[PDB]
Protein backbone atom coordinates (compact mmCIF):
# COMPACT_ATOMS: atom_id res chain seq x y z
CA UNK A 1 0.00 0.00 0.00
CA UNK A 2 1.37 3.15 1.21
CA UNK A 3 5.52 2.61 1.42
CA UNK A 4 8.17 5.09 2.77
CA UNK A 5 11.74 4.84 1.77
CA UNK A 6 14.65 7.15 3.48
CA UNK A 7 17.79 8.70 2.09
CA UNK A 8 20.35 10.82 2.84
CA UNK A 9 24.36 11.20 4.31
CA UNK A 10 24.88 8.06 6.70
CA UNK A 11 27.81 10.02 8.56
CA UNK A 12 27.93 13.52 9.43
CA UNK A 13 30.98 15.89 11.26
CA UNK A 14 29.82 16.64 14.98
CA UNK A 15 28.08 20.71 14.82
CA UNK A 16 26.97 20.20 11.13
CA UNK A 17 23.96 19.18 10.08
CA UNK A 18 22.07 15.84 9.33
CA UNK A 19 19.75 15.82 6.27
CA UNK A 20 16.99 13.06 5.22
CA UNK A 21 14.81 12.54 2.81
CA UNK A 22 11.31 10.43 3.01
CA UNK A 23 10.20 9.32 -0.15
CA UNK A 24 6.70 8.34 -0.21
CA UNK A 25 4.76 5.81 -2.87
CA UNK A 26 1.12 4.72 -3.08
CA UNK A 27 -0.47 8.04 -1.78
CA UNK A 28 -0.07 11.52 -2.32
CA UNK A 29 1.57 13.23 1.01
CA UNK A 30 -1.04 15.95 0.81
CA UNK A 31 -3.82 13.42 1.91
CA UNK A 32 -4.84 12.18 5.02
CA UNK A 33 -1.66 11.53 6.91
CA UNK A 34 1.04 13.15 9.35
CA UNK A 35 4.51 12.42 8.29
CA UNK A 36 6.50 11.96 11.18
CA UNK A 37 10.54 11.43 12.22
CA UNK A 38 11.34 9.34 14.97
CA UNK A 39 14.59 8.11 16.10
CA UNK A 40 15.97 5.07 17.66
CA UNK A 41 19.26 5.10 19.79
CA UNK A 42 21.80 2.45 20.14
CA UNK A 43 20.06 1.57 23.82
CA UNK A 44 16.89 0.37 21.51
CA UNK A 45 14.96 3.57 23.06
CA UNK A 46 12.59 5.09 20.15
CA UNK A 47 11.93 9.19 20.52
CA UNK A 48 9.34 10.90 18.47
CA UNK A 49 10.71 14.02 16.99
CA UNK A 50 8.27 15.42 14.94
CA UNK A 51 6.04 15.66 11.75
CA UNK A 52 4.35 17.34 8.83
CA UNK A 53 1.03 16.88 7.58
CA UNK A 54 -0.58 16.46 4.88
CA UNK A 55 -1.75 20.28 4.76
CA UNK A 56 1.64 21.67 6.01
CA UNK A 57 1.21 22.08 9.57
CA UNK A 58 4.63 20.91 11.76
CA UNK A 59 5.00 19.61 14.95
CA UNK A 60 8.37 18.82 17.05
CA UNK A 61 9.88 17.39 20.16
CA UNK A 62 10.61 20.37 22.61
CA UNK A 63 13.72 17.98 23.66
CA UNK A 64 15.27 19.06 19.96
CA UNK A 65 14.75 22.60 21.16
CA UNK A 66 15.38 24.53 17.79
CA UNK A 67 17.62 22.29 16.21
CA UNK A 68 14.97 20.76 13.98
CA UNK A 69 13.54 21.43 10.49
CA UNK A 70 10.72 19.65 8.92
CA UNK A 71 9.69 20.33 5.55
CA UNK A 72 8.14 18.57 2.10
CA UNK A 73 8.02 19.04 -1.69
CA UNK A 74 5.11 17.72 -2.85
CA UNK A 75 5.68 17.96 -6.39
CA UNK A 76 7.93 15.26 -5.89
CA UNK A 77 5.98 13.40 -3.13
CA UNK A 78 8.51 13.74 -0.23
CA UNK A 79 9.20 14.96 2.94
CA UNK A 80 12.06 15.49 4.83
CA UNK A 81 13.95 16.25 7.76
CA UNK A 82 17.15 18.51 9.03
CA UNK A 83 18.82 18.50 12.61
CA UNK A 84 21.36 20.93 13.09
CA UNK A 85 24.43 21.52 15.89
CA UNK A 86 24.62 17.86 16.13
CA UNK A 87 26.67 15.23 18.44
CA UNK A 88 27.73 11.72 18.72
CA UNK A 89 24.64 11.55 21.06
CA UNK A 90 22.58 12.18 17.94
CA UNK A 91 24.07 9.09 16.33
CA UNK A 92 20.75 6.66 15.91
CA UNK A 93 18.14 4.94 13.13
CA UNK A 94 16.16 7.27 11.82
CA UNK A 95 12.41 6.46 10.39
CA UNK A 96 10.08 7.95 8.73
CA UNK A 97 6.66 6.73 10.06
CA UNK A 98 2.85 7.85 8.10
CA UNK A 99 0.09 7.99 10.82
CA UNK A 100 -3.24 8.61 9.93
CA UNK A 101 -4.11 11.55 10.92
CA UNK A 102 -7.74 10.65 11.87
CA UNK A 103 -7.07 8.11 14.22
CA UNK A 104 -3.24 6.73 14.53
CA UNK A 105 -4.09 4.28 12.11
CA UNK A 106 -2.28 2.31 9.19
CA UNK A 107 1.35 3.23 10.97
CA UNK A 108 3.50 2.49 7.85
CA UNK A 109 7.55 3.25 8.55
CA UNK A 110 10.44 3.06 6.39
CA UNK A 111 13.39 0.73 6.72
CA UNK A 112 15.29 3.10 8.94
CA UNK A 113 18.59 4.60 7.94
CA UNK A 114 21.45 4.92 10.10
CA UNK A 115 23.33 8.27 11.02
CA UNK A 116 26.69 8.11 12.76
CA UNK A 117 27.88 11.73 13.70
CA UNK A 118 31.39 11.37 14.13
CA UNK A 119 35.13 13.27 12.65
CA UNK A 120 36.29 9.69 11.96
CA UNK A 121 37.33 8.57 8.06
CA UNK A 122 35.48 6.51 6.21
CA UNK A 123 37.27 3.53 5.88
CA UNK A 124 37.00 0.60 3.05
CA UNK A 125 37.01 -2.90 4.44
CA UNK A 126 38.89 -5.99 3.95
CA UNK A 127 37.32 -9.09 3.35
CA UNK A 128 38.63 -12.02 4.62
CA UNK A 129 37.27 -15.32 3.24
CA UNK A 130 36.57 -18.58 6.56
CA UNK A 131 37.71 -21.28 5.03
CA UNK A 132 37.01 -24.93 7.15
CA UNK A 133 39.65 -26.79 8.26
CA UNK A 134 40.06 -29.94 7.06
CA UNK A 135 39.05 -32.01 10.08
CA UNK A 136 35.77 -30.50 10.22
CA UNK A 137 35.09 -31.06 7.09
CA UNK A 138 33.92 -35.48 7.38
CA UNK A 139 30.60 -34.42 8.73
CA UNK A 140 27.34 -34.20 7.12
CA UNK A 141 26.94 -30.34 7.22
CA UNK A 142 30.11 -27.93 7.31
CA UNK A 143 30.11 -24.69 8.35
CA UNK A 144 32.04 -21.92 5.86
CA UNK A 145 32.20 -17.64 6.29
CA UNK A 146 33.60 -14.42 5.86
CA UNK A 147 35.27 -11.71 8.13
CA UNK A 148 34.90 -8.29 7.19
CA UNK A 149 37.08 -6.16 8.99
CA UNK A 150 38.01 -2.68 9.43
CA UNK A 151 35.48 -0.25 7.93
CA UNK A 152 33.80 2.61 8.65
CA UNK A 153 31.05 3.87 9.18
CA UNK A 154 28.24 1.05 9.50
CA UNK A 155 26.85 -0.41 7.67
CA UNK A 156 27.98 -2.52 5.67
CA UNK A 157 25.39 -5.80 3.66
CA UNK A 158 26.44 -9.33 3.29
CA UNK A 159 24.52 -11.94 1.22
CA UNK A 160 25.81 -15.45 0.34
CA UNK A 161 25.79 -16.90 -3.83
CA UNK A 162 24.62 -13.02 -4.75
CA UNK A 163 21.38 -13.37 -1.92
CA UNK A 164 20.22 -17.51 -3.77
CA UNK A 165 21.99 -18.76 -0.45
CA UNK A 166 19.88 -17.52 2.61
CA UNK A 167 19.19 -20.78 4.40
CA UNK A 168 22.10 -21.64 7.40
CA UNK A 169 23.46 -18.23 7.38
CA UNK A 170 24.38 -16.47 10.87
CA UNK A 171 25.21 -12.72 10.30
CA UNK A 172 26.32 -11.32 13.52
CA UNK A 173 26.21 -7.73 14.75
CA UNK A 174 29.44 -5.45 13.64
CA UNK A 175 31.82 -4.67 16.90
CA UNK A 176 33.32 -1.40 16.84
CA UNK A 177 36.95 -0.38 18.08
CA UNK A 178 39.31 2.19 17.28
CA UNK A 179 37.06 3.52 14.78
CA UNK A 180 36.98 0.26 12.88
CA UNK A 181 34.35 -1.96 12.49
CA UNK A 182 34.20 -5.95 12.44
CA UNK A 183 31.70 -7.99 11.04
CA UNK A 184 31.16 -12.04 10.75
CA UNK A 185 28.74 -14.22 8.84
CA UNK A 186 28.25 -17.74 8.72
CA UNK A 187 26.70 -20.63 6.41
CA UNK A 188 26.44 -24.05 6.76
CA UNK A 189 25.45 -26.29 3.80
CA UNK A 190 25.24 -30.33 2.93
CA UNK A 191 29.03 -30.99 3.55
CA UNK A 192 28.80 -33.23 0.22
CA UNK A 193 27.40 -29.87 -1.71
CA UNK A 194 30.95 -28.43 -1.04
CA UNK A 195 33.25 -27.64 -2.91
CA UNK A 196 31.19 -28.76 -5.71
CA UNK A 197 28.59 -26.02 -5.31
CA UNK A 198 31.08 -22.71 -5.18
CA UNK A 199 30.26 -20.32 -1.92
CA UNK A 200 30.69 -16.92 -2.08
CA UNK A 201 30.56 -13.56 0.17
CA UNK A 202 28.90 -10.73 -1.05
CA UNK A 203 30.18 -7.68 0.74
CA UNK A 204 28.97 -4.16 -0.30
CA UNK A 205 30.16 -0.54 1.57
CA UNK A 206 27.92 2.03 0.16
CA UNK A 207 29.75 4.94 1.78
CA UNK A 208 33.23 3.92 0.38
CA UNK A 209 31.15 2.74 -3.05
CA UNK A 210 33.28 -1.03 -2.37
CA UNK A 211 32.17 -4.14 -3.19
CA UNK A 212 34.12 -7.72 -2.70
CA UNK A 213 32.84 -11.03 -4.25
CA UNK A 214 34.67 -13.48 -2.10
CA UNK A 215 34.89 -17.06 -3.28
CA UNK A 216 35.95 -19.50 0.06
CA UNK A 217 38.25 -22.05 -1.75
CA UNK A 218 39.07 -24.52 0.30
CA UNK A 219 42.65 -24.98 2.73
CA UNK A 220 44.03 -27.88 0.98
CA UNK A 221 44.45 -28.05 -3.04
CA UNK A 222 42.20 -26.08 -5.63
CA UNK B 1 5.68 14.49 29.58
CA UNK B 2 3.71 11.23 29.33
CA UNK B 3 5.10 8.60 30.91
CA UNK B 4 4.42 4.83 29.38
CA UNK B 5 5.70 2.14 31.23
CA UNK B 6 5.67 -1.24 29.84
CA UNK B 7 5.99 -4.47 32.03
CA UNK B 8 7.39 -7.28 32.47
CA UNK B 9 10.85 -5.83 30.51
CA UNK B 10 10.54 -9.45 29.33
CA UNK B 11 8.59 -12.60 28.76
CA UNK B 12 9.96 -16.14 27.91
CA UNK B 13 7.11 -17.99 26.10
CA UNK B 14 6.41 -21.63 24.69
CA UNK B 15 4.98 -21.65 20.85
CA UNK B 16 1.12 -22.04 21.52
CA UNK B 17 0.97 -20.82 24.68
CA UNK B 18 -0.53 -17.13 25.48
CA UNK B 19 1.25 -14.17 26.12
CA UNK B 20 -0.07 -10.57 27.97
CA UNK B 21 2.10 -7.40 28.57
CA UNK B 22 1.22 -4.17 29.88
CA UNK B 23 1.62 -0.46 29.49
CA UNK B 24 0.56 2.33 32.05
CA UNK B 25 0.52 6.17 31.29
CA UNK B 26 0.76 8.77 33.70
CA UNK B 27 -2.03 10.73 32.36
CA UNK B 28 -5.05 9.40 30.71
CA UNK B 29 -5.41 8.85 27.34
CA UNK B 30 -8.96 9.43 26.16
CA UNK B 31 -9.18 12.66 23.91
CA UNK B 32 -11.92 15.22 23.62
CA UNK B 33 -13.54 13.25 20.99
CA UNK B 34 -14.09 9.89 22.91
CA UNK B 35 -10.74 8.40 21.03
CA UNK B 36 -7.82 6.92 22.63
CA UNK B 37 -4.87 7.46 20.49
CA UNK B 38 -2.72 4.60 22.10
CA UNK B 39 -1.11 1.92 19.40
CA UNK B 40 0.61 -1.06 20.07
CA UNK B 41 4.13 -2.30 17.72
CA UNK B 42 6.19 -5.00 17.71
CA UNK B 43 9.64 -4.69 16.16
CA UNK B 44 11.28 -8.33 15.09
CA UNK B 45 14.92 -8.59 14.65
CA UNK B 46 16.73 -6.30 12.24
CA UNK B 47 13.25 -4.78 10.98
CA UNK B 48 11.45 -1.61 11.73
CA UNK B 49 8.61 -1.37 14.04
CA UNK B 50 5.16 -2.04 12.56
CA UNK B 51 1.70 -1.76 13.43
CA UNK B 52 -0.26 -3.98 15.58
CA UNK B 53 -3.01 -2.30 17.72
CA UNK B 54 -4.26 1.13 17.29
CA UNK B 55 -7.19 3.49 19.09
CA UNK B 56 -6.39 1.21 22.27
CA UNK B 57 -8.78 -1.74 21.30
CA UNK B 58 -8.22 -1.92 17.62
CA UNK B 59 -6.45 -4.35 15.34
CA UNK B 60 -4.55 -2.08 12.44
CA UNK B 61 -4.47 -2.94 8.89
CA UNK B 62 -3.65 -6.58 7.90
CA UNK B 63 -2.70 -7.14 11.50
CA UNK B 64 -3.55 -10.96 12.18
CA UNK B 65 -5.90 -11.46 14.87
CA UNK B 66 -4.46 -13.52 17.26
CA UNK B 67 -3.30 -9.65 19.01
CA UNK B 68 -5.62 -8.23 21.35
CA UNK B 69 -5.68 -4.46 22.47
CA UNK B 70 -7.54 -3.79 25.60
CA UNK B 71 -7.93 -0.93 28.21
CA UNK B 72 -8.48 2.68 28.70
CA UNK B 73 -8.14 5.65 31.11
CA UNK B 74 -4.07 5.03 31.96
CA UNK B 75 -4.00 1.19 31.97
CA UNK B 76 -3.80 -0.86 29.14
CA UNK B 77 -2.97 -4.61 28.01
CA UNK B 78 -1.42 -6.65 24.69
CA UNK B 79 -2.48 -10.25 24.62
CA UNK B 80 -1.15 -12.90 22.48
CA UNK B 81 -3.90 -15.45 22.23
CA UNK B 82 -1.32 -18.14 21.00
CA UNK B 83 2.16 -17.14 20.77
CA UNK B 84 4.03 -18.25 17.18
CA UNK B 85 8.15 -18.24 16.85
CA UNK B 86 7.93 -15.39 14.17
CA UNK B 87 6.30 -13.12 17.00
CA UNK B 88 9.71 -12.90 19.02
CA UNK B 89 10.74 -9.49 18.74
CA UNK B 90 10.39 -5.88 21.25
CA UNK B 91 6.83 -4.88 21.81
CA UNK B 92 6.07 -1.20 22.46
CA UNK B 93 3.37 1.06 22.96
CA UNK B 94 3.11 4.83 22.11
CA UNK B 95 0.86 7.40 22.86
CA UNK B 96 -0.81 10.49 20.25
CA UNK B 97 -2.64 11.93 23.07
CA UNK B 98 -0.32 13.98 24.80
CA UNK B 99 2.20 16.27 23.46
CA UNK B 100 5.05 15.35 22.69
CA UNK B 101 3.85 11.74 21.87
CA UNK B 102 5.74 9.23 23.84
CA UNK B 103 6.54 5.96 23.33
CA UNK B 104 7.36 2.93 26.37
CA UNK B 105 10.54 1.46 27.02
CA UNK B 106 9.49 -2.06 24.86
CA UNK B 107 9.19 -5.45 26.32
CA UNK B 108 11.15 -8.34 24.50
CA UNK B 109 9.40 -11.55 24.08
CA UNK B 110 11.52 -14.48 23.72
CA UNK B 111 10.75 -17.84 22.80
CA UNK B 112 10.74 -20.68 25.36
CA UNK B 113 12.37 -23.93 23.71
CA UNK B 114 14.07 -27.06 24.18
CA UNK B 115 17.80 -26.76 24.96
CA UNK B 116 20.56 -27.39 22.42
CA UNK B 117 24.13 -27.45 22.04
CA UNK B 118 26.06 -24.83 20.33
CA UNK B 119 27.78 -26.35 16.49
CA UNK B 120 30.75 -25.21 17.17
CA UNK B 121 33.26 -24.28 14.58
CA UNK B 122 36.41 -22.30 14.47
CA UNK B 123 38.92 -20.82 11.43
CA UNK B 124 42.46 -19.95 10.84
CA UNK B 125 43.13 -16.47 9.52
CA UNK B 126 43.12 -16.40 5.61
CA UNK B 127 46.17 -16.23 3.67
CA UNK B 128 44.87 -12.66 2.58
CA UNK B 129 44.77 -11.09 5.71
CA UNK B 130 48.38 -12.65 6.85
CA UNK B 131 49.99 -10.56 4.37
CA UNK B 132 48.65 -7.61 5.88
CA UNK B 133 50.50 -8.53 9.36
CA UNK B 134 47.15 -8.91 11.32
CA UNK B 135 45.85 -11.91 12.28
CA UNK B 136 42.32 -13.23 13.24
CA UNK B 137 41.28 -16.74 14.58
CA UNK B 138 37.58 -17.11 14.07
CA UNK B 139 35.21 -19.30 16.79
CA UNK B 140 31.34 -19.71 15.80
CA UNK B 141 28.75 -21.14 17.87
CA UNK B 142 25.67 -21.63 15.91
CA UNK B 143 22.03 -22.75 17.10
CA UNK B 144 22.49 -23.16 21.08
CA UNK B 145 19.20 -22.49 23.44
CA UNK B 146 19.55 -20.51 26.08
CA UNK B 147 21.52 -17.73 24.81
CA UNK B 148 23.76 -17.95 28.18
CA UNK B 149 26.99 -19.14 26.92
CA UNK B 150 30.67 -18.91 27.80
CA UNK B 151 33.43 -19.06 24.88
CA UNK B 152 37.41 -19.47 25.92
CA UNK B 153 40.43 -19.27 23.59
CA UNK B 154 43.36 -21.56 24.67
CA UNK B 155 46.69 -20.76 22.43
CA UNK B 156 49.10 -23.64 22.80
CA UNK B 157 47.32 -24.60 25.84
CA UNK B 158 46.95 -21.53 27.25
CA UNK B 159 44.27 -19.52 28.02
CA UNK B 160 44.10 -16.15 26.16
CA UNK B 161 41.89 -13.09 26.74
CA UNK B 162 43.52 -10.10 25.51
CA UNK B 163 42.44 -9.85 21.58
CA UNK B 164 38.87 -11.22 22.34
CA UNK B 165 35.49 -9.87 20.73
CA UNK B 166 32.37 -11.22 20.80
CA UNK B 167 29.03 -10.79 18.79
CA UNK B 168 25.49 -12.37 19.44
CA UNK B 169 22.34 -12.66 17.57
CA UNK B 170 19.19 -12.00 18.57
CA UNK B 171 16.93 -15.01 18.99
CA UNK B 172 16.27 -17.03 15.38
CA UNK B 173 12.57 -16.97 14.55
CA UNK B 174 13.53 -19.84 12.21
CA UNK B 175 14.33 -22.15 15.08
CA UNK B 176 14.49 -20.68 18.43
CA UNK B 177 17.73 -20.46 18.79
CA UNK B 178 21.02 -18.27 19.80
CA UNK B 179 24.28 -17.81 18.03
CA UNK B 180 27.64 -16.13 18.59
CA UNK B 181 30.83 -14.93 17.50
CA UNK B 182 33.79 -14.79 18.88
CA UNK B 183 37.02 -13.30 17.35
CA UNK B 184 40.50 -13.34 18.57
CA UNK B 185 42.65 -10.67 17.27
CA UNK B 186 46.45 -10.80 17.29
CA UNK B 187 49.67 -9.86 15.18
CA UNK B 188 50.39 -12.02 12.10
CA UNK B 189 54.12 -12.55 14.06
CA UNK B 190 52.15 -13.41 17.12
CA UNK B 191 50.22 -15.95 15.14
CA UNK B 192 53.24 -17.49 13.59
CA UNK B 193 55.14 -17.69 16.81
CA UNK B 194 52.58 -20.11 18.13
CA UNK B 195 51.04 -23.66 16.69
CA UNK B 196 47.31 -24.83 18.31
CA UNK B 197 44.51 -22.70 18.77
CA UNK B 198 41.33 -23.81 20.50
CA UNK B 199 37.65 -22.39 21.32
CA UNK B 200 36.04 -24.02 23.98
CA UNK B 201 32.28 -23.26 24.31
CA UNK B 202 30.63 -24.02 27.99
CA UNK B 203 26.83 -24.20 27.67
CA UNK B 204 24.49 -26.19 29.82
CA UNK B 205 23.34 -28.52 27.24
CA UNK B 206 26.68 -30.27 28.31
CA UNK B 207 29.01 -30.80 31.76
CA UNK B 208 32.16 -31.52 28.93
CA UNK B 209 32.72 -27.84 27.14
CA UNK B 210 32.76 -28.12 22.95
CA UNK B 211 36.38 -27.67 22.20
CA UNK B 212 37.78 -26.95 18.66
CA UNK B 213 41.32 -26.97 17.45
CA UNK B 214 43.56 -26.40 14.75
CA UNK B 215 47.18 -26.39 14.22
CA UNK B 216 48.92 -23.28 12.29
CA UNK B 217 50.32 -24.76 8.49
CA UNK B 218 48.35 -27.45 9.17
CA UNK B 219 45.21 -27.83 6.73
Known amino acids: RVQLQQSGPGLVKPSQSLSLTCTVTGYSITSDFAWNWIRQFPGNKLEWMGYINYSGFTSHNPSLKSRISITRDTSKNQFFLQLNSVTTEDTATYYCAGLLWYDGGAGSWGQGTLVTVSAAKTTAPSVYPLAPVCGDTTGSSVTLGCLVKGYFPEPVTLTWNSGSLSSGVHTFPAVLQSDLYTLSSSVTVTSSTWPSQSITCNVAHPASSTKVDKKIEPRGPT | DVVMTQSPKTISVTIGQPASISCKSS???????????LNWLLQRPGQSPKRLIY???KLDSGVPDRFTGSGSGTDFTLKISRVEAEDLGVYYCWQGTHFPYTFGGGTKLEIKRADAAPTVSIFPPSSEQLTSGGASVVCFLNNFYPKDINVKWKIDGSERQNGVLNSWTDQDSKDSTYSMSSTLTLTKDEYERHNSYTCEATHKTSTSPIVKSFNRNEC
Open chain 2, 27 to 37: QRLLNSNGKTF
Open chain 2, 55 to 57: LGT
